[PDB]
Design a protein around this ligand. Structure first.
Ligand code: NA
Lengths: 300, 300
């Protein structure tokens, strides 16, 4: 019993974290086999970040200008290449601690664990979601760039996020491990405004299912609804539209609890209309959207 | 920027988790050097847990009745002893992955990271606090007993919690690593009622300091208070009494923000009296008490 924001055990990723220094920028890199992956902005000065020509800046750099440190031990960089917004630094030593891994590009609303690092060293772990506007609400200070987000599925680490930027609003942007940004964001210190941060409706429903599992039932009402009638409500509360694909994904939690998905949708509509009246649900005073259906099943 | 419930990296503890089976109870043990620590209720059947005589039950057990598995590899138990509510199983092999460690008995209101395990295998990590009634609000299913709570301080793992029990109310009880329960709880399946779950006032203040650091300032008022006047308020809201030791611990966060501790106390009094009016603070609709002053400084 009980229900926590639960991250994957971080040990497999800790063994992959290194320090990358270029000139006088230090950040974190990910060492898998004989490649170190890091944000390409490692090559930029402060002034460069205002308006960087990455191809031009990369002309000035050779293999020996990339200082890679794994603990207290120096890796020899034997090649480098830019792939979208990441650098790949070929090193002469394969990481002996390399886990089984893949690179995956997640969808908006998918969750992951972050291992926030500074100077190549693990600081801490927490859960995140890919917001529908393609930002995350991380905890990242100066030096945390190159910290990664991941899921562990079947003892295989699926890397989904590398940290690049903090927006002026203090939310976070980054790439997949092919170096493609999530959303419209660029690795430039310029005005970048996030769009509407909508609520991940399918996740809220999963968490309501989690609450019923755990004995928090007060919010279950006597109504049902339709996907269209629900969605007219969802849209006025900046909730994402629910699809029949969402309903299908909730089926196992429906089966477990005996609560039809549309019934749970009607309960959520009443919570949106009437609020929570100073009550809580799984110890939250608001509707939590950073648990996926799969996250709930895994935890329960 | 941003502020998360942040756990320590779990890798150092993952390397210590083993499976312990006695008869047909399986749970988790902690392998440090040549000792495995686990809950003594490993020796109990279901029926035994109603009213166990641990000394008598232990008469029936020899070293070979304790099956200890580290991954896919069997440890030889060469001695065993009961220390309060834990068993210590001496094994013939020192754990090669043993970190620098200590055993510490924390105070009520102190926080820690939990690595929830099943069958000796890491499942996930989250933060907890030792409630003032000496329960924790974990996430623990059947098989999770022996999962540990810890802090990492200076690359030394300080073990503070081993999981033993779920109360009928679905909160959790356990021991330190000397096997002494936190609070009045016993390793018996009997009616055990927790006392009043009060709020950890010093922690709330730390989190208000965290919010100011991160730019969430709306709740700062124009008042001050006194420790006595504050505490008359705290007591009616089942908040723990604030002491001058608490004020002293908040000094660094006071210094950073320029907000005198008693001023922040007055802000909290208004939040207790008037509530939050549907607003949030560091994305919580309620006052969060599971960050210590030290936790905030570490994260910021
Ligand atoms: Na909340």
């Amino acid at each position: 019993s009980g229900f926590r924001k639960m991250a994957f055990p971080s040990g497999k990723v800790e063994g992959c974290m290194v320090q990358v220094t270029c000139g006088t920028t230090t950040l974190n890199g990910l060492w898998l086999d004989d490649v170190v992956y890091c944000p390409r902005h490692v090559i930029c000065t402060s002034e460069d970040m205002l308006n960087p020509n990455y191809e031009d800046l990369l002309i000035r750099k050779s293999n020996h200008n990339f200082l890679v440190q794994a603990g207290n031990v120096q890796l020899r960089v034997i090649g480098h290449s830019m792939q979208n917004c990441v650098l790949k630094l070929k090193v002469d030593t394969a990481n002996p601690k390399t886990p089984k891994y893949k690179f995956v590009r997640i969808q908006p609303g998918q969750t992951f664990s972050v291992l926030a690092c500074y100077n190549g060293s693990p600081s801490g772990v927490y859960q995140c979601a890919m917001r529908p506007n393609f930002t995350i609400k991380g905890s990242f200070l100066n030096g945390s760039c190159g910290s990664v987000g991941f899921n562990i599925d079947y003892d295989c680490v699926s890397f989904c996020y590398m940290h690049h930027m903090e927006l002026p609003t203090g939310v976070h942007a980054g790439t997949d491990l092919e170096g493609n940004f999530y959303g419209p964001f660029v690795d430039r210190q310029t005005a970048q405004a996030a769009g509407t941060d909508t609520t991940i409706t399918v996740n809220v429903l999963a968490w309501l299912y989690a609450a019923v599992i755990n004995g928090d039932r007060w919010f279950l009402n006597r109504f049902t609804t339709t996907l269209n009638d629900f969605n007219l409500v969802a849209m006025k509360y900046n909730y994402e539209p629910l699809t029949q694909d969402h309903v299908d994904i909730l089926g196992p939690l429906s089966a477990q609890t005996g609560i039809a998905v549309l019934d749970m949708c009607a309960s959520l509509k009443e919570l949106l209309q009437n609020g929570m009246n100073g009550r809580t649900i799984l110890g939250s005073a608001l509707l939590e959207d950073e648990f996926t259906p799969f996250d709930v099943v895994q935890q329960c």
